[PDB]
Amino acid sequence: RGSHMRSLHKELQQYISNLSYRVKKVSEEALMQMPIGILLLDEEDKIEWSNRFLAACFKEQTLIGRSLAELSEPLAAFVKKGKTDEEIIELNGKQLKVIVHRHERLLYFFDVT
Amino acid sequence: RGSHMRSLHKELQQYISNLSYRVKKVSEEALMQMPIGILLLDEEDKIEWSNRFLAACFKEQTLIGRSLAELSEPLAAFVKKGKTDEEIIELNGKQLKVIVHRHERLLYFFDVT
Numbered sequence: 001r002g003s004h005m006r007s008l009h010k011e012l013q014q015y016i017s018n019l020s021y022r023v024k025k026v027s028e029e030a031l032m033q034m035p036i037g038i039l040l041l042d043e044e045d046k047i048e049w050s051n052r053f054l055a056a057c058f059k060e061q062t063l064i065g066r067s068l069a070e071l072s073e074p075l076a077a078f079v080k081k082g083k084t085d086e087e088i089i090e091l092n093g094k095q096l097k098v099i100v101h102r103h104e105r106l107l108y109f110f111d112v113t
Numbered sequence: 114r115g116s117h118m119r120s121l122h123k124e125l126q127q128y129i130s131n132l133s134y135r136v137k138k139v140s141e142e143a144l145m146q147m148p149i150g151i152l153l154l155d156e157e158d159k160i161e162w163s164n165r166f167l168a169a170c171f172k173e174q175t176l177i178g179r180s181l182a183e184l185s186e187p188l189a190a191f192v193k194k195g196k197t198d199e200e201i202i203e204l205n206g207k208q209l210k211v212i213v214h215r216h217e218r219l220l221y222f223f224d225v226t
Contacts, residue, residue, distance in 0.1 A: 011142075017130050017131045018127050018128055018130045029124075029127065032216045033214050033215055033216035033218040033219050034214070035214075085210065085225045086199060086210060086225075088198055088199055095198050097198065097199060101146050101147065101148075101225070102145050102226075104146065105145075105146035105147075106147050112198045112199075113215075
């Protein structure tokens with residue numbers, strides 16, 4: 001209900017500069033040092049933008065609109081609490097990195113093969 | 114000796130877009146959701162670029178040229194091993210976030226008040 005990604009616009013439009021908005025195959029900068037998957041949501045658990053690479057590497061058909069709890073149960077409570085900074089669990093053999101701050105405006109989760 | 118940050122140029126020049134190279138006071142986007150301190154080094158323990166904000170919040174005069182071990186002992190062994198992804202310790206009252214990958218070209222440490 002409370003879209004954060006689309007509540008400021010500039011905030012997200014700022015971060016999504018250095019990287020291509022297409023986020024497909026990431027052949028532009030290669031994948032040997034940078035995150036293999038990126039996920040960005042609102043302040044409730046509704047995903048907004050995500051780098052395709054993660055889904056493919058997770059064996060999914062569509063990760064968007066799949067809420068947070070559906071994707072993972074351990075971090076489901078975490079996204080509903082925000083009383084921490086970062087955490088790295090493991091899924092599909094790769095680590096699942098989660099990160100949140102104060103105003104969790106920059107809250108995101110990445111994958112770590 | 115082997116400056117990774119200056120070995121590619123484009124690699125670092127790409128990431129340093131969204132944010133101002135000035136990195137002073139961060140009044141541009143504020144500090145209520147984003148990292149309070151940024152640090153980037155080579156593949157040995159020689160720091161190359163860092164956001165001033167971290168030093169100030171650490172009670173330092175100059176962090177650049179202070180190697181890795183001089184700043185912190187726990188992560189000193191870590192920077193020389195690279196057998197992990199991320200870790201968050203605590204220093205000066207804020208969490209100290211460290212992150213490394215494969216080719217640790219994007220290896221960096223952030224502070225988490």
